[PDB]
Design an enzyme around this catalytic site. Sequence first.
Site, mmCIF file in Angstrom:
data_model
loop_
_atom_site.group_PDB
_atom_site.id
_atom_site.type_symbol
_atom_site.label_atom_id
_atom_site.label_comp_id
_atom_site.label_asym_id
_atom_site.label_seq_id
_atom_site.Cartn_x
_atom_site.Cartn_y
_atom_site.Cartn_z
ATOM 1 N NE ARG B 57 -3.263 2.506 2.678
ATOM 2 C CZ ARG B 57 -4.258 2.965 3.429
ATOM 3 N NH1 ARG B 57 -5.224 2.156 3.859
ATOM 4 N NH2 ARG B 57 -4.322 4.255 3.747
ATOM 5 C CB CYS B 163 14.535 16.178 2.955
ATOM 6 S SG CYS B 163 14.289 14.404 3.059
ATOM 7 C CG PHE B 214 14.434 8.482 1.294
ATOM 8 C CD1 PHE B 214 13.727 8.145 2.408
ATOM 9 C CD2 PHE B 214 14.726 9.816 1.079
ATOM 10 C CE1 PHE B 214 13.286 9.100 3.307
ATOM 11 C CE2 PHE B 214 14.328 10.796 1.975
ATOM 12 C CZ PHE B 214 13.566 10.438 3.077
ATOM 13 N N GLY B 215 15.317 7.642 -2.983
ATOM 14 C CA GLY B 215 15.985 7.302 -4.214
ATOM 15 C C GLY B 215 17.279 8.066 -4.422
ATOM 16 C CG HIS B 302 12.101 17.810 -0.702
ATOM 17 N ND1 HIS B 302 13.109 17.315 -1.481
ATOM 18 C CD2 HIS B 302 11.725 16.867 0.191
ATOM 19 C CE1 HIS B 302 13.363 16.038 -1.103
ATOM 20 N NE2 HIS B 302 12.537 15.757 -0.102
ATOM 21 C CG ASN B 335 12.559 12.257 -0.566
ATOM 22 O OD1 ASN B 335 13.555 12.959 -0.760
ATOM 23 N ND2 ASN B 335 11.821 12.259 0.553
#
Lengths: 388, 388
Positions: B57, B163, B214-215, B302, B335
Amino acid sequence: VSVSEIRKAQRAEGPATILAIGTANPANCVEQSTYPDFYFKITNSEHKTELKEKFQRMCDKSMIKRRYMYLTEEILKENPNVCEYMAPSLDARQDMVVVEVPRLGKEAAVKAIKEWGQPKSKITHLIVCTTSGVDMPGADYQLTKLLGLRPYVKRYMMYQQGCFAGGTVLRLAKDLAENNKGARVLVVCSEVTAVTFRGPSDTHLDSLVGQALFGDGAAALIVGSDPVPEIEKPIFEMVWTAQTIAPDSEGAIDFHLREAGLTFHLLKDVPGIVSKNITKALVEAFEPLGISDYNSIFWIAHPGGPAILDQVEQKLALKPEKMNATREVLSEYGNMSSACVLFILDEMRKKSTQNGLKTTGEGLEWGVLFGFGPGLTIETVVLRSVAI
Amino acid sequence: VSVSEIRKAQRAEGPATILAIGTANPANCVEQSTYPDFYFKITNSEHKTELKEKFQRMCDKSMIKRRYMYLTEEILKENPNVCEYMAPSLDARQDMVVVEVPRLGKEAAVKAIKEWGQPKSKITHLIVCTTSGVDMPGADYQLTKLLGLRPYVKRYMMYQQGCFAGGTVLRLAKDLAENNKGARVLVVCSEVTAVTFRGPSDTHLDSLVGQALFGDGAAALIVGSDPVPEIEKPIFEMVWTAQTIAPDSEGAIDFHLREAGLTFHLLKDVPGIVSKNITKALVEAFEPLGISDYNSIFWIAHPGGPAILDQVEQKLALKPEKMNATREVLSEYGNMSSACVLFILDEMRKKSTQNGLKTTGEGLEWGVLFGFGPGLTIETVVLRSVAI
């Protein structure tokens, strides 16, 4: 809406100026004369007689009389992994320094803000610099909370910088103060050796050098352009800065953040690299000013070890007094990494004023501050003193 | 020697301008739709069936189609401690990201320097930013070496920022370009999730969210004031910046660097905090410019998670199209922490030029860029587009 009208109204006018300096150290004072006995016992290495003797000669050659350390015998006895040369211990070390950095920084900042005398709400930028530990939100957020700065203070969290970053924080605060009308920058360097403290190993004599040299402390400044006459009190002015990497110095100084804490390695001759490249840095800074006599300016140099100082003195034929303030700080506190050069500015301005000289730079007009560290990096800051 | 003459002659005149943008990602493309299966098998968590459905999900609602990752299946099978939720693994993750951060940033920096067109010896300042690993000398030194920048490039190493530091690097680069005549700043944000990737745990769902979002990616800029007409090509101008800490957000977002790598925690409703405080940030930035219609400016936010975007959009009544560039970047890359907002500026200026709009900010004059991260911190940068 004119961007050029906004830009003109936004920027400050004059040189970034140091307006207050405050320092602080952990309460535990550690004498260097008896350190070898204490260190080899607390790291359970009393059997390593040849190694202890080597260490004893390092401490004796250090020219450091005492250091302040957050680490105590009681803390070390609760952390045997910290006392080994290489044991998983980052989580323990981090839990010490994530609290102690900002705590120590706060004591130095409160003193600098008291000296400056202006409302803390006028602090528009905050630069925090440490090589000890890291966390998110960082020590900049912790100091914002601890000191009660405004929540919109503009923060610059400089982590894992090393010994040369007293230079870096001045070079940065210069541009923040000069580019922004009204800006008042609090600068806090706070360095705690709990992440580098470690047991001795006869195959790692560079690491051992770090145990004889590194000590704790925090220094804080208030930096701003266009001081308010007779309300604010200029101490030094910053005029020009530079940062360079010495040739032939790759791997000279390295620190790695590992599961065993922050390791330290010295692979080249630092005193010889710095002294071979210091003249080039001085000519870049001073030639445009018409100055070539390096005894005619006041001196601040990061005291990585006493040999750096001796070799620079020898190379340039500095009179022995030029390094006095620098040596006095090495003698009383050891190598406090980024904070050292700020303590040296404080010592010099206090001695100059106490001694009734004409300027804060030992009666001289122009001065130079140098930061040295990993890279091998050299940071240069050209300063002007202030009358009285 | 007049310091005020030196100061007038040292400083630039006009607004800091983005002159080139270049991006890079690791070759390994990871599809989101099948990520759950792939992630649960590489971490040995197939038996965790309620847990896997919940990650499914998360991944389905993430609005990310794919991410680029340095971490491969082969790399993970060689590191089970990295695949566990909490095992001693920082040494192995550091070994990956001390090398991969600068390598990936180098690729983006080369691309930005090619676009810019000018000799890399004209780069005076270098800002490198990463939340992935730390080392001494840092990633700034490595990038200086890898690109063959001058040894005297003035470096700013921004580690463990989080971030929100896409905004921080522009705020920094703005003062550096503007205070220094001829200064040309190379900005490099490079973020690699090898320090945060960990195995799933049913009692730490905040951690698990991070593994859906996260990437990896690097973005590079050239920033300078007083562009040479018809030689350099302005893309966006910076006009004003701010950083603040939202009220009631203590502990909302935290990352700790431990023996087990970088842990990620979410203790408060981030989409709620952001959306509740975004208006204050907007009036501080735009009230002085007489602007109150937030659909009249171009937007860069962002993309922490899609819910931040949805709740900001709903709060202000932005038309759906305002977040299109932001959402396209979230879609294609996830992100990527600090780099993300830089990838968004690239996307927007490229679509606006491609589509024949009148300005690089979607045919609009004024725009806003926002970084969100630990504190809870909000970074604001006010931008003006360029004609064509």
